């Protein structure tokens, strides 16, 4: 039921959007895992450039 002079909108929520939500709470640990992998590779390839 609309009213005085707003927008018309079409939101995409008529499915079951709620079993399938995704939290970005593991954002830092994801960063931390990478460094320790990114360091260690460059230690494995010792003098070779780290970038590649």
């Amino acid at each position: 039921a609309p009213s005085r002079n707003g927008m018309i909108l079409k939101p995409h929520f008529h499915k079951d959007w709620q079993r399938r939500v995704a939290t970005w709470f593991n954002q830092p640990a994801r960063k931390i895992r990478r460094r320790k992998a990114r360091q260690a590779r460059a230690r494995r390839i010792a003098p070779r450039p780290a970038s590649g």
């Binding site: 039921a1 609309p2 009213s3 005085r4 002079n5 018309i8 079409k10």
Partner: protein, 147 residues
């Protein structure tokens, strides 16, 4: 902040702000944008005209990178370069006439909205407009095309 709301002020008040003759029942008009032809015809003829129908041709697989032409006017042209340039021109009287690339600073077509001060500038751009080409020659400059 719950403590700044108006549910913290309708305690005691029996109906929580929604009447006694008519009540906050579930979905009493429809559910969504239903009824543009039936029993909401008036909101959509009044505040949203052009909604129902169909018009125009169809372009099926449209790529918005082919159609790309960033625009600029003349007033906002001497700001692509620094201040050494515009001042060292009109000076030493050789016919300096500097060069201004627009495709460097992220612009392709040139437009003739404004005016510009009297120095004999040169311009390089892919496209031009009619009036823009005139104003430049009117001040004593030139226009140049590139690929």
């Amino acid at each position: 902040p719950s403590r700044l709301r108006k549910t913290r002020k309708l305690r005691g008040h029996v109906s929580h702000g929604h009447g006694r003759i008519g009540k906050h029942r579930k979905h009493p008009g429809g559910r969504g944008n239903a009824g543009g032809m039936h029993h909401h015809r008036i909101n959509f003829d009044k505040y949203h005209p052009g909604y129902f129908g169909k018009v125009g041709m169809r372009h099926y697989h449209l790529k918005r990178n082919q159609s790309f032409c960033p625009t600029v006017n003349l007033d906002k042209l001497w700001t692509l370069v620094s201040e050494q340039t515009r001042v060292n021109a009109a000076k030493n009287k050789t016919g300096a006439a500097p060069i201004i690339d627009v495709v460097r600073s992220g612009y392709y077509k040139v437009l003739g909205k404004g005016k510009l001060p009297k120095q004999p500038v040169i311009v390089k751009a892919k496209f031009f407009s009619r009036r823009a080409e005139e104003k430049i020659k009117g001040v004593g400059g030139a226009c140049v095309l590139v690929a």
